[PDB]
Design a protein around this motif. Sequence first.
Motif, PDB file in Angstrom:
ATOM      1  N   UNK A 106      46.269  40.250  77.327  1.00  0.00           N
ATOM      2  CA  UNK A 106      45.877  40.593  75.960  1.00  0.00           C
ATOM      3  C   UNK A 106      46.598  39.824  74.870  1.00  0.00           C
ATOM      4  N   UNK A 108      47.873  39.007  70.994  1.00  0.00           N
ATOM      5  CA  UNK A 108      48.496  39.865  70.006  1.00  0.00           C
ATOM      6  C   UNK A 108      49.003  39.102  68.798  1.00  0.00           C
ATOM      7  N   UNK A 109      49.172  39.805  67.672  1.00  0.00           N
ATOM      8  CA  UNK A 109      49.735  39.203  66.462  1.00  0.00           C
ATOM      9  C   UNK A 109      51.207  39.575  66.454  1.00  0.00           C
ATOM     10  N   UNK A 110      52.124  38.583  66.469  1.00  0.00           N
ATOM     11  CA  UNK A 110      53.550  38.917  66.459  1.00  0.00           C
ATOM     12  C   UNK A 110      54.027  39.567  65.165  1.00  0.00           C
ATOM     13  N   UNK A 161      65.150  40.131  74.325  1.00  0.00           N
ATOM     14  CA  UNK A 161      65.053  40.187  72.866  1.00  0.00           C
ATOM     15  C   UNK A 161      63.827  39.548  72.249  1.00  0.00           C
ATOM     16  N   UNK A 163      60.254  39.313  71.506  1.00  0.00           N
ATOM     17  CA  UNK A 163      59.172  40.272  71.658  1.00  0.00           C
ATOM     18  C   UNK A 163      58.005  39.764  72.472  1.00  0.00           C
ATOM     19  N   UNK A 167      56.558  41.482  75.786  1.00  0.00           N
ATOM     20  CA  UNK A 167      55.187  41.956  75.864  1.00  0.00           C
ATOM     21  C   UNK A 167      54.405  41.261  76.965  1.00  0.00           C
TER      22      UNK A 167
ATOM     23  N   UNK B 106      64.657  49.616  72.766  1.00  0.00           N
ATOM     24  CA  UNK B 106      65.194  48.262  72.641  1.00  0.00           C
ATOM     25  C   UNK B 106      64.696  47.479  71.441  1.00  0.00           C
ATOM     26  N   UNK B 107      65.631  46.874  70.731  1.00  0.00           N
ATOM     27  CA  UNK B 107      65.288  46.089  69.554  1.00  0.00           C
ATOM     28  C   UNK B 107      64.767  44.746  69.993  1.00  0.00           C
ATOM     29  N   UNK B 108      64.024  44.093  69.117  1.00  0.00           N
ATOM     30  CA  UNK B 108      63.462  42.804  69.469  1.00  0.00           C
ATOM     31  C   UNK B 108      63.190  41.929  68.261  1.00  0.00           C
ATOM     32  N   UNK B 109      63.109  40.611  68.480  1.00  0.00           N
ATOM     33  CA  UNK B 109      62.767  39.670  67.413  1.00  0.00           C
ATOM     34  C   UNK B 109      61.282  39.391  67.558  1.00  0.00           C
ATOM     35  N   UNK B 110      60.464  39.694  66.526  1.00  0.00           N
ATOM     36  CA  UNK B 110      59.028  39.431  66.642  1.00  0.00           C
ATOM     37  C   UNK B 110      58.670  37.952  66.711  1.00  0.00           C
ATOM     38  N   UNK B 119      63.486  43.858  64.794  1.00  0.00           N
ATOM     39  CA  UNK B 119      62.691  45.085  64.673  1.00  0.00           C
ATOM     40  C   UNK B 119      63.337  46.155  65.560  1.00  0.00           C
ATOM     41  N   UNK B 155      46.096  50.715  74.992  1.00  0.00           N
ATOM     42  CA  UNK B 155      47.154  49.765  75.337  1.00  0.00           C
ATOM     43  C   UNK B 155      46.800  49.032  76.631  1.00  0.00           C
ATOM     44  N   UNK B 158      44.148  46.476  76.508  1.00  0.00           N
ATOM     45  CA  UNK B 158      44.494  45.313  75.714  1.00  0.00           C
ATOM     46  C   UNK B 158      43.970  45.324  74.288  1.00  0.00           C
ATOM     47  N   UNK B 160      45.446  46.962  71.603  1.00  0.00           N
ATOM     48  CA  UNK B 160      46.483  47.118  70.579  1.00  0.00           C
ATOM     49  C   UNK B 160      46.943  45.704  70.187  1.00  0.00           C
ATOM     50  N   UNK B 162      48.622  44.647  67.336  1.00  0.00           N
ATOM     51  CA  UNK B 162      49.930  44.464  66.712  1.00  0.00           C
ATOM     52  C   UNK B 162      50.978  44.448  67.820  1.00  0.00           C
ATOM     53  N   UNK B 163      51.706  43.340  67.945  1.00  0.00           N
ATOM     54  CA  UNK B 163      52.668  43.218  69.029  1.00  0.00           C
ATOM     55  C   UNK B 163      53.758  44.264  69.009  1.00  0.00           C
ATOM     56  N   UNK B 166      52.480  47.544  70.216  1.00  0.00           N
ATOM     57  CA  UNK B 166      52.274  47.479  71.664  1.00  0.00           C
ATOM     58  C   UNK B 166      53.602  47.589  72.408  1.00  0.00           C
ATOM     59  N   UNK B 167      54.594  46.809  71.984  1.00  0.00           N
ATOM     60  CA  UNK B 167      55.894  46.827  72.631  1.00  0.00           C
ATOM     61  C   UNK B 167      56.583  48.173  72.491  1.00  0.00           C
ATOM     62  N   UNK B 170      55.079  50.399  75.056  1.00  0.00           N
ATOM     63  CA  UNK B 170      55.562  50.135  76.407  1.00  0.00           C
ATOM     64  C   UNK B 170      56.978  50.686  76.625  1.00  0.00           C
ATOM     65  N   UNK B 171      57.860  50.501  75.656  1.00  0.00           N
ATOM     66  CA  UNK B 171      59.217  51.010  75.813  1.00  0.00           C
ATOM     67  C   UNK B 171      59.242  52.544  75.763  1.00  0.00           C
TER      68      UNK B 171
END
Lengths: 182, 182
Positions: A106, A108-110, A161, A163, A167, B106-110, B119, B155, B158, B160, B162-163, B166-167, B170-171
Amino acid sequence: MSPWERILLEEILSEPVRLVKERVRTHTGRELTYVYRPGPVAASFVLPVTERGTALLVRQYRHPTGKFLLEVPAGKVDEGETPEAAARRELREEVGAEAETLIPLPSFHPQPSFTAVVFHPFLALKARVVTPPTLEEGELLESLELPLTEVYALLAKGEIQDASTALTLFYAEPHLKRLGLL
Amino acid sequence: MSPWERILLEEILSEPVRLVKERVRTHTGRELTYVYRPGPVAASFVLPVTERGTALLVRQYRHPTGKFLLEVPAGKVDEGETPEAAARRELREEVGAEAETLIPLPSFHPQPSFTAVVFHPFLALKARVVTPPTLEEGELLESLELPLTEVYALLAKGEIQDASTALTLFYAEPHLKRLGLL
Ligand SMILES: [Mg+2]
Ligand SMILES: [Mg+2]
Ligand SMILES: [Mg+2]
Ligand SMILES: [Mg+2]
Protein backbone atom coordinates in the motif's frame (compact mmCIF):
# COMPACT_ATOMS: atom_id res chain seq x y z
CA MET A 1 -13.93 20.35 -6.22
CA SER A 2 -11.20 21.74 -3.98
CA PRO A 3 -12.47 23.50 -0.86
CA TRP A 4 -9.77 26.18 -1.23
CA GLU A 5 -9.40 28.61 -4.11
CA ARG A 6 -6.03 29.73 -5.46
CA ILE A 7 -5.33 33.46 -5.34
CA LEU A 8 -1.64 33.29 -6.24
CA LEU A 9 0.96 30.52 -6.40
CA GLU A 10 4.58 31.62 -5.89
CA GLU A 11 7.62 29.39 -6.44
CA ILE A 12 9.95 29.76 -3.45
CA LEU A 13 12.60 27.31 -4.62
CA SER A 14 12.99 24.97 -7.61
CA GLU A 15 16.22 23.14 -6.74
CA PRO A 16 17.34 21.05 -4.95
CA VAL A 17 13.63 20.82 -4.15
CA ARG A 18 10.60 22.71 -5.49
CA LEU A 19 8.72 24.63 -2.80
CA VAL A 20 5.74 26.93 -3.24
CA LYS A 21 3.96 29.54 -1.20
CA GLU A 22 0.29 29.67 -2.12
CA ARG A 23 -2.17 32.37 -1.15
CA VAL A 24 -5.64 30.81 -1.10
CA ARG A 25 -9.15 31.69 0.00
CA THR A 26 -10.29 29.04 2.48
CA HIS A 27 -13.59 27.47 3.49
CA THR A 28 -14.13 30.46 5.79
CA GLY A 29 -13.77 32.98 2.98
CA ARG A 30 -10.60 34.31 4.60
CA GLU A 31 -7.14 34.27 3.05
CA LEU A 32 -4.37 31.95 4.13
CA THR A 33 -0.80 31.43 2.93
CA TYR A 34 0.14 27.75 2.59
CA VAL A 35 3.74 26.61 2.01
CA TYR A 36 4.30 23.14 0.62
CA ARG A 37 6.19 20.84 -1.73
CA PRO A 38 3.81 20.46 -4.69
CA GLY A 39 2.91 17.36 -6.66
CA PRO A 40 2.78 15.24 -8.50
CA VAL A 41 5.97 13.72 -7.08
CA ALA A 42 6.78 10.26 -5.74
CA ALA A 43 9.39 7.89 -4.38
CA SER A 44 9.68 4.10 -4.15
CA PHE A 45 10.77 2.07 -1.10
CA VAL A 46 11.80 -1.56 -1.41
CA LEU A 47 12.35 -4.20 1.28
CA PRO A 48 14.83 -6.65 -0.36
CA VAL A 49 14.68 -10.13 1.11
CA THR A 50 17.08 -12.94 0.22
CA GLU A 51 16.31 -16.60 -0.15
CA ARG A 52 18.02 -17.05 3.21
CA GLY A 53 15.41 -14.96 5.01
CA THR A 54 17.67 -11.94 5.50
CA ALA A 55 17.04 -8.36 4.38
CA LEU A 56 19.41 -6.06 2.52
CA LEU A 57 19.14 -2.69 4.24
CA VAL A 58 21.06 0.55 4.35
CA ARG A 59 22.41 2.65 7.25
CA GLN A 60 22.12 6.16 5.82
CA TYR A 61 23.02 9.64 7.00
CA ARG A 62 19.90 11.87 7.02
CA HIS A 63 21.23 15.38 7.51
CA PRO A 64 18.06 17.07 8.81
CA THR A 65 18.07 14.61 11.75
CA GLY A 66 21.84 14.49 12.12
CA LYS A 67 21.52 10.69 12.43
CA PHE A 68 22.41 7.57 10.45
CA LEU A 69 19.13 5.66 10.14
CA LEU A 70 18.45 1.99 9.32
CA GLU A 71 16.26 2.07 6.19
CA VAL A 72 15.12 0.01 3.24
CA PRO A 73 16.63 1.24 -0.09
CA ALA A 74 14.51 4.00 -1.63
CA GLY A 75 14.52 6.96 -3.94
CA LYS A 76 12.62 9.49 -5.96
CA VAL A 77 10.72 8.15 -8.98
CA ASP A 78 12.24 9.89 -12.03
CA GLU A 79 10.25 11.65 -14.74
CA GLY A 80 8.41 9.07 -16.83
CA GLU A 81 9.67 6.12 -14.76
CA THR A 82 7.27 3.64 -13.09
CA PRO A 83 7.46 3.20 -9.31
CA GLU A 84 8.52 -0.43 -9.77
CA ALA A 85 11.38 0.63 -12.08
CA ALA A 86 12.54 3.28 -9.61
CA ALA A 87 12.45 0.59 -6.91
CA ARG A 88 14.63 -1.75 -8.93
CA ARG A 89 16.98 1.09 -9.87
CA GLU A 90 17.46 2.37 -6.33
CA LEU A 91 17.97 -1.23 -5.17
CA ARG A 92 20.78 -1.60 -7.69
CA GLU A 93 22.27 1.82 -6.94
CA GLU A 94 22.18 1.67 -3.18
CA VAL A 95 22.77 -2.01 -2.39
CA GLY A 96 24.14 -3.24 -5.73
CA ALA A 97 21.31 -5.76 -5.80
CA GLU A 98 18.75 -7.29 -8.13
CA ALA A 99 15.64 -9.24 -7.25
CA GLU A 100 12.97 -11.35 -8.90
CA THR A 101 9.35 -10.67 -7.97
CA LEU A 102 8.42 -7.27 -6.53
CA ILE A 103 5.13 -7.36 -4.61
CA PRO A 104 3.57 -3.92 -4.38
CA LEU A 105 2.45 -2.82 -0.91
CA PRO A 106 0.00 0.00 0.00
CA SER A 107 1.14 3.46 -0.99
CA PHE A 108 1.12 6.27 1.51
CA HIS A 109 1.73 10.00 2.02
CA PRO A 110 4.57 10.52 4.53
CA GLN A 111 3.48 14.05 5.52
CA PRO A 112 0.38 15.24 3.64
CA SER A 113 0.30 18.52 5.58
CA PHE A 114 3.51 19.61 3.88
CA THR A 115 4.14 17.55 0.81
CA ALA A 116 2.19 16.04 -1.99
CA VAL A 117 4.67 13.17 -2.33
CA VAL A 118 3.36 9.61 -2.51
CA PHE A 119 5.65 6.79 -1.32
CA HIS A 120 5.28 3.40 -3.06
CA PRO A 121 6.50 0.41 -0.98
CA PHE A 122 7.49 -2.96 -2.45
CA LEU A 123 8.61 -6.33 -1.09
CA ALA A 124 11.38 -7.71 -3.35
CA LEU A 125 11.99 -11.47 -3.33
CA LYS A 126 15.17 -13.43 -4.04
CA ALA A 127 17.27 -10.32 -3.64
CA ARG A 128 20.93 -10.79 -4.40
CA VAL A 129 23.99 -8.57 -4.65
CA VAL A 130 25.44 -8.59 -8.15
CA THR A 131 27.39 -5.36 -8.46
CA PRO A 132 29.04 -2.58 -6.44
CA PRO A 133 26.75 0.21 -5.25
CA THR A 134 26.70 3.47 -7.26
CA LEU A 135 25.82 6.34 -4.95
CA GLU A 136 24.92 9.88 -5.92
CA GLU A 137 26.91 12.84 -4.74
CA GLY A 138 25.05 13.65 -1.56
CA GLU A 139 24.23 10.08 -0.52
CA LEU A 140 26.17 8.77 2.48
CA LEU A 141 25.22 5.19 3.30
CA GLU A 142 26.46 1.65 3.76
CA SER A 143 24.54 -1.49 2.96
CA LEU A 144 24.16 -4.33 5.42
CA GLU A 145 22.43 -7.64 5.82
CA LEU A 146 20.28 -8.66 8.77
CA PRO A 147 18.23 -11.76 9.58
CA LEU A 148 14.51 -10.93 9.19
CA THR A 149 13.91 -12.12 12.74
CA GLU A 150 16.28 -9.39 13.95
CA VAL A 151 14.75 -6.73 11.70
CA TYR A 152 11.29 -7.53 13.03
CA ALA A 153 12.57 -7.65 16.60
CA LEU A 154 13.87 -4.09 16.14
CA LEU A 155 10.51 -3.10 14.66
CA ALA A 156 8.60 -4.53 17.63
CA LYS A 157 11.01 -2.90 20.08
CA GLY A 158 10.29 0.45 18.46
CA GLU A 159 13.84 0.98 17.19
CA ILE A 160 13.06 1.62 13.51
CA GLN A 161 12.96 5.45 13.41
CA ASP A 162 12.35 5.97 9.71
CA ALA A 163 8.58 5.90 9.33
CA SER A 164 8.57 4.68 5.75
CA THR A 165 10.85 1.77 6.52
CA ALA A 166 8.73 0.88 9.57
CA LEU A 167 5.49 1.02 7.57
CA THR A 168 6.99 -1.00 4.69
CA LEU A 169 7.98 -3.68 7.24
CA PHE A 170 4.49 -3.78 8.72
CA TYR A 171 2.84 -4.13 5.31
CA ALA A 172 5.42 -6.75 4.24
CA GLU A 173 5.02 -8.94 7.31
CA PRO A 174 1.92 -10.93 6.27
CA HIS A 175 3.49 -11.70 2.88
CA LEU A 176 6.76 -12.81 4.47
CA LYS A 177 4.88 -15.16 6.81
CA ARG A 178 2.80 -16.47 3.91
CA LEU A 179 5.91 -17.19 1.87
CA GLY A 180 7.61 -18.94 4.80
CA LEU A 181 10.39 -16.37 5.04
CA LEU A 182 9.34 -15.17 8.51
CA MET B 1 30.53 14.14 15.00
CA SER B 2 28.53 15.14 11.93
CA PRO B 3 29.94 13.87 8.65
CA TRP B 4 29.07 17.17 6.95
CA GLU B 5 30.48 20.58 7.81
CA ARG B 6 28.42 23.78 7.67
CA ILE B 7 29.68 26.48 5.32
CA LEU B 8 26.63 28.74 5.50
CA LEU B 9 23.06 28.34 6.75
CA GLU B 10 20.46 30.58 5.08
CA GLU B 11 16.86 30.97 6.28
CA ILE B 12 14.55 30.68 3.26
CA LEU B 13 11.28 31.09 5.13
CA SER B 14 10.30 31.47 8.80
CA GLU B 15 6.49 31.40 8.58
CA PRO B 16 4.18 29.60 8.15
CA VAL B 17 7.06 27.12 8.28
CA ARG B 18 10.81 27.59 8.80
CA LEU B 19 12.90 26.36 5.88
CA VAL B 20 16.66 26.60 5.44
CA LYS B 21 19.13 26.24 2.61
CA GLU B 22 22.46 25.00 3.93
CA ARG B 23 25.73 24.97 2.03
CA VAL B 24 27.87 22.18 3.48
CA ARG B 25 31.10 20.36 2.71
CA THR B 26 30.30 16.65 2.42
CA HIS B 27 32.13 13.39 3.09
CA THR B 28 33.69 13.75 -0.37
CA GLY B 29 35.14 17.18 0.38
CA ARG B 30 32.84 18.71 -2.23
CA GLU B 31 30.17 21.31 -1.56
CA LEU B 32 26.46 20.58 -1.59
CA THR B 33 23.39 22.72 -0.95
CA TYR B 34 20.80 20.99 1.26
CA VAL B 35 17.28 22.39 1.75
CA TYR B 36 15.30 21.21 4.75
CA ARG B 37 12.95 22.01 7.62
CA PRO B 38 15.30 22.26 10.63
CA GLY B 39 14.84 20.92 14.13
CA PRO B 40 14.20 20.52 16.84
CA VAL B 41 10.50 20.33 16.01
CA ALA B 42 7.84 17.72 16.77
CA ALA B 43 4.20 16.72 16.58
CA SER B 44 2.01 14.27 18.51
CA PHE B 45 -0.46 11.77 17.03
CA VAL B 46 -3.11 10.10 19.17
CA LEU B 47 -5.37 7.13 18.43
CA PRO B 48 -8.42 7.73 20.70
CA VAL B 49 -10.29 4.55 21.54
CA THR B 50 -13.58 4.44 23.43
CA GLU B 51 -14.71 1.88 25.95
CA ARG B 52 -16.96 0.53 23.22
CA GLY B 53 -14.02 -0.45 21.04
CA THR B 54 -14.50 2.36 18.53
CA ALA B 55 -11.97 5.02 17.49
CA LEU B 56 -12.50 8.76 17.26
CA LEU B 57 -10.88 9.83 14.00
CA VAL B 58 -10.89 12.84 11.74
CA ARG B 59 -11.49 13.23 7.97
CA GLN B 60 -9.22 16.17 7.17
CA TYR B 61 -8.45 18.21 4.08
CA ARG B 62 -4.68 18.08 3.34
CA HIS B 63 -4.13 20.75 0.71
CA PRO B 64 -0.82 19.52 -0.75
CA THR B 65 -2.58 16.24 -1.71
CA GLY B 66 -5.90 17.85 -2.60
CA LYS B 67 -7.59 15.04 -0.62
CA PHE B 68 -9.57 14.59 2.60
CA LEU B 69 -7.69 11.88 4.51
CA LEU B 70 -8.82 9.63 7.38
CA GLU B 71 -6.38 10.37 10.22
CA VAL B 72 -5.94 10.14 13.97
CA PRO B 73 -6.02 13.60 15.68
CA ALA B 74 -2.57 15.21 15.70
CA GLY B 75 -0.69 18.45 15.87
CA LYS B 76 2.54 20.29 16.37
CA VAL B 77 4.00 20.19 19.89
CA ASP B 78 4.12 23.82 21.09
CA GLU B 79 7.16 25.51 22.61
CA GLY B 80 7.79 24.10 26.07
CA GLU B 81 4.88 21.64 25.87
CA THR B 82 5.37 17.87 26.36
CA PRO B 83 4.33 15.52 23.55
CA GLU B 84 1.69 13.96 25.81
CA ALA B 85 0.21 17.40 26.56
CA ALA B 86 0.12 18.30 22.86
CA ALA B 87 -1.63 14.97 22.24
CA ARG B 88 -4.30 15.69 24.82
CA ARG B 89 -4.69 19.26 23.55
CA GLU B 90 -5.08 18.31 19.90
CA LEU B 91 -7.51 15.56 20.92
CA ARG B 92 -9.64 18.18 22.67
CA GLU B 93 -9.32 20.72 19.86
CA GLU B 94 -9.97 18.43 16.94
CA VAL B 95 -12.45 15.88 18.31
CA GLY B 96 -13.66 17.68 21.45
CA ALA B 97 -12.52 14.66 23.44
CA GLU B 98 -10.71 13.72 26.63
CA ALA B 99 -9.21 10.38 27.58
CA GLU B 100 -7.72 8.61 30.57
CA THR B 101 -4.47 6.69 30.06
CA LEU B 102 -2.22 7.62 27.13
CA ILE B 103 0.18 4.81 26.21
CA PRO B 104 3.19 6.13 24.33
CA LEU B 105 4.09 4.30 21.11
CA PRO B 106 7.42 4.38 19.20
CA SER B 107 8.37 7.77 17.82
CA PHE B 108 9.36 8.16 14.22
CA HIS B 109 10.63 10.59 11.57
CA PRO B 110 8.05 10.93 8.77
CA GLN B 111 10.57 12.11 6.15
CA PRO B 112 14.13 12.39 7.52
CA SER B 113 15.51 13.38 4.10
CA PHE B 114 13.64 16.66 4.28
CA THR B 115 12.60 17.40 7.82
CA ALA B 116 13.97 17.04 11.27
CA VAL B 117 10.49 16.61 12.74
CA VAL B 118 9.84 13.75 15.14
CA PHE B 119 6.28 12.39 15.40
CA HIS B 120 5.19 10.99 18.80
CA PRO B 121 2.29 8.47 18.62
CA PHE B 122 0.02 7.62 21.55
CA LEU B 123 -2.86 5.22 22.19
CA ALA B 124 -5.50 7.01 24.31
CA LEU B 125 -7.92 4.86 26.34
CA LYS B 126 -11.47 5.59 27.47
CA ALA B 127 -11.76 8.44 25.00
CA ARG B 128 -14.95 10.40 25.25
CA VAL B 129 -16.39 13.53 23.65
CA VAL B 130 -17.02 16.24 26.22
CA THR B 131 -17.00 19.50 24.28
CA PRO B 132 -17.35 20.97 20.79
CA PRO B 133 -14.21 20.96 18.65
CA THR B 134 -12.18 24.20 18.40
CA LEU B 135 -10.39 24.30 15.07
CA GLU B 136 -7.68 26.70 13.98
CA GLU B 137 -8.09 28.95 10.99
CA GLY B 138 -6.66 26.73 8.31
CA GLU B 139 -7.93 23.40 9.65
CA LEU B 140 -10.77 21.82 7.66
CA LEU B 141 -11.90 18.54 9.20
CA GLU B 142 -14.81 16.61 10.64
CA SER B 143 -14.62 14.05 13.41
CA LEU B 144 -16.16 10.62 13.12
CA GLU B 145 -16.42 7.37 14.99
CA LEU B 146 -15.63 3.94 13.58
CA PRO B 147 -15.59 0.44 15.05
CA LEU B 148 -11.96 -0.67 15.54
CA THR B 149 -12.66 -3.77 13.48
CA GLU B 150 -13.51 -1.49 10.54
CA VAL B 151 -10.49 0.75 11.09
CA TYR B 152 -8.19 -2.27 11.08
CA ALA B 153 -9.95 -3.74 8.06
CA LEU B 154 -9.19 -0.51 6.18
CA LEU B 155 -5.59 -0.71 7.38
CA ALA B 156 -5.20 -4.30 6.15
CA LYS B 157 -6.85 -3.43 2.82
CA GLY B 158 -4.27 -0.69 2.35
CA GLU B 159 -6.80 2.16 2.43
CA ILE B 160 -5.18 4.29 5.17
CA GLN B 161 -3.14 6.78 3.07
CA ASP B 162 -1.73 8.93 5.85
CA ALA B 163 1.50 7.20 6.86
CA SER B 164 1.51 8.44 10.42
CA THR B 165 -2.01 7.26 11.07
CA ALA B 166 -1.19 3.88 9.50
CA LEU B 167 1.96 3.48 11.59
CA THR B 168 0.19 4.56 14.79
CA LEU B 169 -2.44 1.87 14.10
CA PHE B 170 0.20 -0.79 13.58
CA TYR B 171 2.01 0.10 16.81
CA ALA B 172 -1.30 0.30 18.71
CA GLU B 173 -2.59 -3.07 17.56
CA PRO B 174 -0.79 -5.33 20.07
CA HIS B 175 -1.92 -3.11 22.96
CA LEU B 176 -5.52 -3.09 21.75
CA LYS B 177 -5.51 -6.90 21.54
CA ARG B 178 -3.90 -7.13 24.98
CA LEU B 179 -6.54 -4.87 26.48
CA GLY B 180 -9.37 -6.83 24.83
CA LEU B 181 -10.48 -3.90 22.69
CA LEU B 182 -9.59 -5.63 19.40
MG1 LIG C 1 17.75 6.60 -1.40
MG1 LIG D 1 19.36 6.67 -4.05
MG1 LIG E 1 -4.05 18.39 13.47
MG1 LIG F 1 -4.92 20.75 15.28
